[model samples]
Target: CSPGIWQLDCTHLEGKVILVAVHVASGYIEAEVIPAETGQETAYFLLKLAGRWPVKTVHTDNGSNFTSTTVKAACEWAGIKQEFGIPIESMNKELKKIIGQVRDQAEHLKTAVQMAVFIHNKKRKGGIGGYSAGERIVDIIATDIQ
Candidate 1:
């Protein structure tokens, strides 16, 4: 419903943590599996998302990790507005379901998560008028499937 708004959230599975950032514009998502939830992980991933997109405001819960000094400084230094996030409950649910399905078969759960994100980005969302999230990030019409 808005542009320049990115949401961050975390979830646990198989005793590890996963962090995901959802850009509100096209429902674009990027995620990484972390050993634990920490300020370092949060800040690093925040910067990682900034590298790919023009991150103006980062919305996350007021959890320990999100409120830590590391995240605070990173946001200020990077000129990103830090806000609390509570939306996109469905994204976490969907990601967890996909990750869970691949848990037993994955050589590395991180790789499984990577595949899940790829699948999500490639999906043609009805909310976005049948355009895949990946397609919205750039401008091009594919002649054939890659």
Candidate 2:
């Protein structure tokens, strides 16, 4: 979501697509549900983000889904660069814990996941001034142009 670089994190949800894409630069987080976690699933996701933003580099923890040949070719065709094996090993565990909490608490797994996405982003508070990082930074960079 941020200019180019984003961290794609996923956890097994109902044995499924519980992907949380984080825009480090913009400080925006989007949790999404797709048909399933396939190469094409992640592929198309990045493609759409490219259409909306000035995409360049993508950061991902090595998962077969994005690491596979299918996804590799897709990004290649888009002229996008992919970087794997992210240095933040704890992020996977940290976000994994976040998803695990909601996973067990709700019955309708699909509904629970969808709800978690909204709640996670909406409820976050920040320390810099009264505005939170997530609340303040999404479009903050745009103001510099004026």
Candidate 3:
């Protein structure tokens, strides 16, 4: 919601953090359900995950919930820069890469599914078969976007 500011009582919902990170370049998403929402807590959780490269920027939607002082402080301490997506526009980038490029016949998703299966069959990397994009760009798997 944008063009005008609005606030909601998100407190009623369980505070469990649903951390979602996307590789903007590849349209890959990594999601995890966290137990805490504090900065230090989130930081420590990420710390345990193995990383091949350091993250330089962390982006999030402009929800008041993400503006937690503790989370920001933790990101700062971890040498990560925080970037906010303009309200109602945060998904534009992802949308363009995910669905906007698809045709009106709704065949992009079908092609995407096939491409993923093909990659998996070839013993490709990423979550599917452990063939992940490393620090330096190595491979650009093409998905049929008909």
Candidate 4:
């Protein structure tokens, strides 16, 4: 939440790894696998790392780290969007149905989810130097969602 927003996803694994994915743009997602649960402090630190780029908006699911008052306040201080999230009621109804199968299967493979994030980031090819989304997204500008 420095000067831009990073939409993130966290997949928890038992004795495995903490996976965090921040989508930098359409068809391009970058990720990191930390060794523990990501808290507010961790989130802030990650933002600092991501601050290598200039950002104006962030998007993330309703995880505790994403929803924490500290996180929101930090985003405000940094001049970034703090609440640009999809509506929960809509997801609970319509969207949930489409992803129900995936959700049901997620519990069985959270570790794999973590691994997948790492692999996706490593495989990304867009952006400068083909940088794997580690704050290299400052160059990308937003367009209306297609």
Best-matching candidate per lDDT? 1
Model 4, range 1-146, lDDT digits (tens) per residue?
A: 23244555554333544334354353234334465554665467446744654556766677776777777777776676655456512222322232333444455444445345444444445533655543344334332221
Residues 1-146, model 1: lDDT tens digits: 44567889898777889999887767778989987799998999988777766778888888899999999998988889998746366889988887777667769989999988988888775645677888776532122122
- TM-score winner: 1
Which lDDT tens digits does candidate 3 get at residues 1-146? 11111111111112334444444443333334455555555555434321422455666655554667765766666666667757713422333343333324344344443343233233334445555433212233222111
Give candidate 3's error at residue 120 in angstroms: 9.5
TM-scores, each model vs. reference: 0.84, 0.67, 0.42, 0.49
| Model 2 TM-score relative to the real fold | 0.67
Q: Model 1: how far is 127 from its true place, Å?
A: 14
Model 2, 62-144: lDDT tens digits are 77887978778877877778887634334445455656677767776666666665555555455234544356444554553
The candidate 2 region of ten consecutive residues with least summed lDDT is 86-95
lDDT of 3: 0.41
Models sorted by TM-score, best on top: 1, 2, 4, 3
Looking at model 3, the pairs that clash are 125-131, 126-131, 126-132
Better of 2 and 4 by lDDT: 2
Q: Residue pairs in steric clash, candidate 4?
A: 3-55, 4-55, 4-56, 5-57, 5-58, 6-58, 7-59
Candidate with the larger lDDT of 1 and 2: 1
**Minimal lDDT window, size 10, model 1:** 137-146
List the pairs of residues colliding in candidate 2. Answer: none
lDDT of each: 0.81, 0.65, 0.41, 0.48
Rate residue 18 of model 1 by lDDT: 92
